[PDB]
Amino acid sequence: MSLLPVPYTEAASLSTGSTVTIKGRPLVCFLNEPYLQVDFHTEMKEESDIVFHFQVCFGRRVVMNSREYGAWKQQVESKNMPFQDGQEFELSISVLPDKYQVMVNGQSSYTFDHRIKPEAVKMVQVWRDISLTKFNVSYLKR
Amino acid sequence: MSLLPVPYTEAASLSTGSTVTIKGRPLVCFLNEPYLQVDFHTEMKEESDIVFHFQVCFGRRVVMNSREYGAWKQQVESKNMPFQDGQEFELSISVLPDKYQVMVNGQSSYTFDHRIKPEAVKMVQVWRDISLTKFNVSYLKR
Ligand SMILES: CC(=O)N[C@@H]1[C@@H](O)[C@@H](O)[C@@H](CO)O[C@H]1O
Ligand SMILES: CC(=O)N[C@@H]1[C@@H](O)[C@@H](O)[C@@H](CO)O[C@H]1O
Numbered sequence: 001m002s003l004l005p006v007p008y009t010e011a012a013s014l015s016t017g018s019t020v021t022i023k024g025r026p027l028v029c030f031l032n033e034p035y036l037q038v039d040f041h042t043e044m045k046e047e048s049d050i051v052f053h054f055q056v057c058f059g060r061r062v063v064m065n066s067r068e069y070g071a072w073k074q075q076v077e078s079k080n081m082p083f084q085d086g087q088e089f090e091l092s093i094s095v096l097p098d099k100y101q102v103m104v105n106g107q108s109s110y111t112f113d114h115r116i117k118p119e120a121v122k123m124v125q126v127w128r129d130i131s132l133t134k135f136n137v138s139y140l141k142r
Numbered sequence: 143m144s145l146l147p148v149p150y151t152e153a154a155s156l157s158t159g160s161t162v163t164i165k166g167r168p169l170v171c172f173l174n175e176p177y178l179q180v181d182f183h184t185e186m187k188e189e190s191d192i193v194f195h196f197q198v199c200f201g202r203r204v205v206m207n208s209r210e211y212g213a214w215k216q217q218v219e220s221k222n223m224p225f226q227d228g229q230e231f232e233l234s235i236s237v238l239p240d241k242y243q244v245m246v247n248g249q250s251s252y253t254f255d256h257r258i259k260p261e262a263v264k265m266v267q268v269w270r271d272i273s274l275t276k277f278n279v280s281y282l283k284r
Pocket of ligand 2: 189190191210211212213
């Protein structure tokens, strides 16, 4: 179906049971090392703090972090690479009480314990070297 | 004026006196560390060898390299950062007899000695976190 603009910005709220679903594909082969970045921002401004930073170097590594009062905190680096060269991915990020859980094509792939309350999130940005066909934030829970 | 598609691909030939001129701007503030990549490819295929790889992490560093028979060679890393936060840039890459010379907004900023004859180049790709308004390869010289 249709392409969303990239970089993609949507105003968002998150609490426990919220799911962010992202369908997309890398713009180029893994040999050229395309990136994907998903940032959960505390304001609509791109300079705002990031509760959850998720950055894929396709075929190589994933880094997760937070930016709190303008400053990057403890990097978590993963060599877990469920993303397939040249394929569409479906990414689903669940807000559990203790952490974010990242599902890649239906497989649990990364978790990241909450450093800031998910209620602090006001915006989600999806950007770098991807096309996007689907973006959804679920709003079913009290 | 109008935006070119990014990633941007143009079939190209280079020899001594050839200039590649690129006008663009980063998609986001330097705090979010947008990238720019310019690759001079030996074929139209994106998997093809790269005679000259130029990768800016805006506000941080520049790496230059070649990919020869699929393999990255000796990285050159520069902390020279003439790019201004939130500004349009003009990038001009000249083919001199011994090297590429990179001008940023009219200032000599990087050089890269030839590892492969520039005549090997068949394609130029400009990609990552930029908008593009201008791309030109000059063809004035014998
Ligand atoms: C909560 C808060 O003010 N966060 C700010 C953020 O908005 C931005 O201005 C950043 C720039 O470095 O600095 C942070 O300290
Ligand atoms: C000259 C040549 O064949 N270069 C190839 C390149 O086209 C690509 O296939 C790459 C994939 O790793 O391998 C290189 O050795």
